[PDB]
């Protein structure tokens, strides 16, 4: 009835993530137990366990227990002459897949069975080297970027080729849809193609606004947003329905904060944060509040001068942790106080 005949509060916390200011605290480095000086190519959080995997230009692949204080080492594996271009977990999380720069063989590490299977020969595949690849969220498909604008679809369980898709021009980047029923491929002339997984047909061809050539592409888990990065540092965010039906879609908001070409795009699992990065400049990483399409003003503390060049970003499955990998061999980790679960 009245709040000034008693003593009490007026301001309370919201369930949704607040805009403008992000509450964060620095944590211990992910690769603290295993220090290195080589560039960190990939960092990723395990889907079902508190495990973080760090791979880099040094030939080692490591798995770490995710603890804020110490981050103890679980296991580290060194390959002979295999500088890891990209390493990722499977959708189920049971096996680890890694690839190298200018190497034909693809390494599959099955943790449950304790077997390391090198897939050097894929039948029906004419590709000389395998460096760029993506995995579907459902876990039934694997996509390999090739040459002459070729996309190769492989079964996950047996690693055998299903079919091929050819686009005009070079393949710059590719990603899978949230439902895993479609493929988004960005070409080298700024055009983006949409392919159907079940029948390898081109559903639609739309054009990213003001893009000479694209470098990255990402999709949200809920299926609402599609993000495309270009050479000028401009990231365009679209509705997924707009991309499917319009040849010249109008983006919801074009992020002009980054000034150098965007190479990394990562969506928050709750679809409230978009992380953008450029490796050509130091301190070139930003965070975007998705519903408002506004950038948090407090994340990059440029005086500390720790982030430097950014090559890989990842979020914990419940968005409790944020990971960052640089060229100095430091896998930086931050905790977001808004999310209390790993």
């Amino acid at each position: 009835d009245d709040l000034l005949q008693r003593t009490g509060n007026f301001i309370s916390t919201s369930t949704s993530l607040p805009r403008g200011i992000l509450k964060m605290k620095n944590c211990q480095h992910a690769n603290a137990e295993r220090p290195t000086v080589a560039r960190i190519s990939s960092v990723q959080f395990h889907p079902g366990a508190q495990i973080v995997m760090v791979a880099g230009l040094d030939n080692a692949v490591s798995l770490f227990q995710v603890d804020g204080k110490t981050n103890p080492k679980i296991q580290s594996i060194y390959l002979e002459r295999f500088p890891i271009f990209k390493a990722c977990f499977s959708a189920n999380g049971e096996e680890v897949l890694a690839t190298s720069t200018h190497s034909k063989v693809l390494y599959v590490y099955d943790m449950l069975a304790g077997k390391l299977i090198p897939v050097h020969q894929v039948r029906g595949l004419k590709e000389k080297i395998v460096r760029s690849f993506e995995v579907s969220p459902d876990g039934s498909f694997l996509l390999i970027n090739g040459i002459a604008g070729y996309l190769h679809l492989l079964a996950m369980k047996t690693k055998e080729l299903i079919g091929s898709m050819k686009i005009n021009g070079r393949v710059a980047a590719s990603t899978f849809s949230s439902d895993s029923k479609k493929v988004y491929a960005s070409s080298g002339d700024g055009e983006v193609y949409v392919w159907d997984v079940n029948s390898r047909k081109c559903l639609n061809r739309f054009v990213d606004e003001g893009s000479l050539y694209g470098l990255s592409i990402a999709t949200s888990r809920n299926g609402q947003y599609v993000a495309c990065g270009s050479n000028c540092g401009v990231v365009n965010i679209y509705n997924q329905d707009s991309c499917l039906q319009e040849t010249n879609p109008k983006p919801i908001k074009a992020i002009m904060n980054l000034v150098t070409g965007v190479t990394s795009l990562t969506f928050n699992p709750t679809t409230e944060i978009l992380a953008i990065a450029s490796e050509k400049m130091k301190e070139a990483v930003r965070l975007v509040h998705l519903p408002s399409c506004t950038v948090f003003s407090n994340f990059p503390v440029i005086k500390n001068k720790n982030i430097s060049h950014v090559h890989t970003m990842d979020f914990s499955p419940r968005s409790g942790y944020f990971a960052l990998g640089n060229e100095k061999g430091k896998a930086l980790m931050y905790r977001l106080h808004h999310y209390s679960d790993f």
Binding site: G8, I11, S12
Partner: protein, 357 residues
């Protein structure tokens, strides 16, 4: 900037506005004299709330008595300025459930004093019920909310252009409970329960329900009917009264939105089969025109729709046999169409005994 950073200036402005309003209240037909000043009072404070990076509890604690004074006044412009201030505060800051409850209570209780500011006030409530936590508001202001003249007509007028979903989302769970309480018991008046059922009927007929309010209403009706039918006392006469009260509502909810009742019945089959509540489910589906196609079989815990086309062939015979009994008896929960396509589809399958049935 000096208004939001320095609280003394804001207190000065509010005190000046209140004193000027109190001075000019005595003279009849002096509302125009307070125009510009009140506009100034509307112009700055909202803008101040826009300018502040974070609105601390001090600002809201200072603003609240003046908000209450604006709500209690009879001047239209002063109430309008209070409404704008309340709207901006609700948009910007998150509030505890108690303070939202008190603010909504004060908005609802003083709505009818000025008849020219009803609509905006209701719309203001919608904003307060859209930017806050869903269960912030309680049940205490519900009667005074129902007693305002021509509530559903104003709600429909607002609905033609803007979304009115939060107010109905708040209203319906209370409306069903209050209707059941009127059916079995006493209220403030019999016309109170009558105006409750009239409100729910008018909401069903005139205002289109969107954002899955249909599923919520159907689930509330089914769940609470089953819950009251599960009371320790028999109340057979009260049960019949409740049935004749809910019959037209179920009729119209089926008619306007066809498939919602089927889905909500499908979602609730499992726990009804788990418990010994098959007879109550049969009574509820008999209350509807369609939904008797989900009648449980006499011997097993399966629905009639699933019994007709599930893989196991022998027990399917009983289903058609049950349909035959449903054929001969007084069909009340089932319709002609379902029986027709069921028999037409079952004439042509593999099993010869099924063909004979």
């Amino acid at each position: 900037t000096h208004c939001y950073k320095d609280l003394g200036f804001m207190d000065f402005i509010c005190s000046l506005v209140t004193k000027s309003v109190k001075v000019f209240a005595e003279y009849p037909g002096s509302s125009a004299q307070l125009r510009v000043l009140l506009a100034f009072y509307a112009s700055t404070i909202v803008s101040a709330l826009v300018a502040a990076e974070d609105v601390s509890d001090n600002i809201i604690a200072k603003l609240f008595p003046y908000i209450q004074k604006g709500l209690k006044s009879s001047l239209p412009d002063y109430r309008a300025a209070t409404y704008m201030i309340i709207c901006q505060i609700s948009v910007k800051v998150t509030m505890e459930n108690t303070f939202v409850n008190s603010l909504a209570s004060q908005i609802i209780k003083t709505l009818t004093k000025i008849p020219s500011l009803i609509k905006d006030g209701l719309s203001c409530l919608i904003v307060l019920l859209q930017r806050q936590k869903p269960e912030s508001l309680g049940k205490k202001p519900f009667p005074h909310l129902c007693n305002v003249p021509d509530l559903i007509t104003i709600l429909h007028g607002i609905s033609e252009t803007y979304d009115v979903s939060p107010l109905l989302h708040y209203m319906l769970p209370h409306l069903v409970v209050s209707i059941i309480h009127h059916v079995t018991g006493e209220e403030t008046e019999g016309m109170d329960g009558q105006i409750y059922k009239r409100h729910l009927e008018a909401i069903l007929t005139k205002i289109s329900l969107k954002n899955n309010l249909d599923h919520l209403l159907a689930s509330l009706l089914f769940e609470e009917y089953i819950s009251y039918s599960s009371q320790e006392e028999m109340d057979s006469n009260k049960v019949s009264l409740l049935n004749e009260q809910f019959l037209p509502l179920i009729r119209l909810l089926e008619s306007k939105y066809p498939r919602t009742l089927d889905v909500v019945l499908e979602e609730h089959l499992k726990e009804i089969a788990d418990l010994k509540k098959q007879e109550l489910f049969h009574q509820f589906v008999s209350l509807s025109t369609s939904g008797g196609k989900y009648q449980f079989l006499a011997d097993s815990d399966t629905s009639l729709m699933l019994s007709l086309n599930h893989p196991l062939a022998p027990v399917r015979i009983l289903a058609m046999n049950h349909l035959k009994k449903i054929m001969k008896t007084s069909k009340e929960g089932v319709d002609e169409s379902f029986i027709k396509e069921a028999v037409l589809a079952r004439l042509g399958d593999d099993n010869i005994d099924v063909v004979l049935s």
